[PDB]
């Protein structure tokens, strides 16, 4: 189904480096539809909840500290297979090993400053969307270019 949605966050390093527009344009060109979008400086509570799966790990603190250190651009994109497709467009965890053409492959060098993060599964996407966005902040009616889907 064409209504799958994923959550993407341009982290503070991506915003600070002026990469927001470049990133959004890659998803728009692909044909995914923007369904939610806003810039905010995450609070500690929102960050700890977002990274809750890592809470027992040592690196949890650093992830929380970094994401609340500056503005973040949060967005929700809709489309067929968007969850896995957006991860492929992002690259792998280590930017140095990500292929040229991917966001991290083209712009990043360090695991801890890897620019953007997207949901890893439909289930986590559904959880993340509900955490970061109020229902009224998301488009209800979506209309993709008519030349994108059979």
């Amino acid at each position: 189904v064409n209504k799958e949605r994923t959550f993407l966050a341009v982290k503070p390093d991506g915003v600070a480096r002026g990469l927001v527009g470049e990133i959004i344009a890659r998803y728009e060109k692909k044909g995914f539809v923007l369904v939610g979008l806003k810039q905010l400086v995450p609070t500690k509570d929102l960050a700890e909840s977002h990274y809750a799966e890592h809470k027992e790990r040592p690196f949890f603190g650093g992830l929380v500290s970094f994401i609340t250190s500056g503005p973040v651009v949060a967005m929700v994109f809709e489309g067929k297979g968007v969850v896995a497709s957006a991860r492929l467009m992002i690259g792998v965890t280590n930017p140095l090993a990500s292929a040229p053409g991917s966001i991290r492959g083209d712009f990043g060098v360090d695991v801890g400053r890897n620019i953007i993060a997207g949901s890893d599964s439909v289930e986590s996407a559904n959880r993340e969307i509900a955490l970061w966005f109020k229902p009224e902040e998301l488009l209800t009616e979506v209309k993709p270019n008519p030349n994108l889907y059979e």
Copy 2:
């Protein structure tokens, strides 16, 4: 002063044509800082207030109808001379007469589908920002790349 701000709205035609990222990237490359950003479908009340200066004119209705017909990406950019600079980057009212290199010059053809609109003066910017955005939706602390200003 380097803290001047302007309000820009990517209208429904610009969002529908997948031009949001392209537009944001032009302002980021220029060195202006994103201070507010969100997508919303304007209500009639917000639209009539935004276009209040034209309320006695015949074309008022059409402007209100069009802007509430679909999603809009609202944003606030900060920087020296941003109000006039952003207008220059946009082009003139008629896209056909706008120079190649400007947003309307590169992407538009009709006055009524001219993609984006920006504040025409600091005073109108201040009014528009307060209409479209709550104070907590705007960054308070802004940090431009350190190589941009003397």
Copy 3:
């Protein structure tokens, strides 16, 4: 009216320099619709007819010789004000004096190797289209993106 058409020819120097795609993309992004397109090596008869307005001038021979020296990409674009708009996107006769952002301003240096030429008026466009293209080579039904025109 939205059905005006203009004739554009990417000259041999533009084809040889690998600029065909770059040029077509500029008109597509603008919103003009491709209505005719083909590559051919012009015959002397077609060239002399195309440049017939200059036939009494000394430089006529050189224009004819150059345009028949290699492949040319001929195209017809449709849209509101396309004739004048396409000239503005091209630049002025001398590439050195053309503004950055225009095709000649961005890519050319010499009057005699100025990459592309477009019709100078609706009347000349109508004549040029009929010279270079058979009626069955042109789209009859045209459908522009629906977000381009009011």
Copy 4:
């Protein structure tokens, strides 16, 4: 040998989405030479012949219907290993699984709207070129940039 040729068709969805110039530019930058180019609306006879290998399959009808639904940009490119190289530049059948950097990976989302198709072998290329183009529509003498081949 440097004179191998392949047939590429930008399908109706690619033309409708304004991707013709972007696609041609990718092959020009690569160093392949444009040897044939035209826009046409395929007739049913030409479509059934093009897709003749699938004629016994159920999905044959849909392929024929779609390709004759609007304009197509047909082209022939020449160069060493162009047949396999052009397929690699295109991506795999499913755009969602195509790598960022490839045409389908960057712009497509659905198998049935996958933008462009290229010959799968030299033999099929030779058949397709002869179907879509008359011999006089193809360049006989080809001259690649002199810095491309040893």
Copy 5:
């Protein structure tokens, strides 16, 4: 004549912002030929000599201080009318008033951080080239693409 040369320096702010490649590519696409190129951190003596025309003015000190504050990418480009053409591609002194499409118009905001500077006349170019480059650092034989000049 096609052998005119101009001197361009990407100042410390341009180097620091990662704009070197973008700038060089604009001149290469235009058709000008790179005849000299190097990165160096200017010494005070070289800076005072470069800005010698302003030595009696108050702002002289600041120009000298800034240009010696970090790496500079110095280059010499060759081609017809390159001196005036390169200035047009750069924009005017104030980046805010420079047109979109020009380097300063697209990337700058402050007079004192205006990214790049080029020779203002053939005479000053000849002086600047001799100051910044040793004769053996410059190409003697130049070969422009053959499709650029008549």
Copy 6:
């Protein structure tokens, strides 16, 4: 460590094709820092030393002949994992088999005209840097954007 360095040379075919700026921009966008840069026409002695590992092979002569046939743009980039990362950004030896998104994948077609070459290991990088550049030609103090490294 973040101070690893690699040597890259845009070969004569890359310079001749106007690809210098495009290539430098890819490394700048990635976040690597330019630490050395110059254009020169290699002497036979420098070439034979650069390709010394192949001196017993038949193709040695051709490599030496080609690299001394015209200008070369030599550069040194600094950053974490830059040696392997730059090779990945370049592609594989055969441009036809290099993935779209890589420099050779996007721009090349022949093994002998493969545009650019980078060090294959830290040890060879250290040798190549010392061969092509004098110590005073390299930046001593390097400052990467502060948003690149943790």
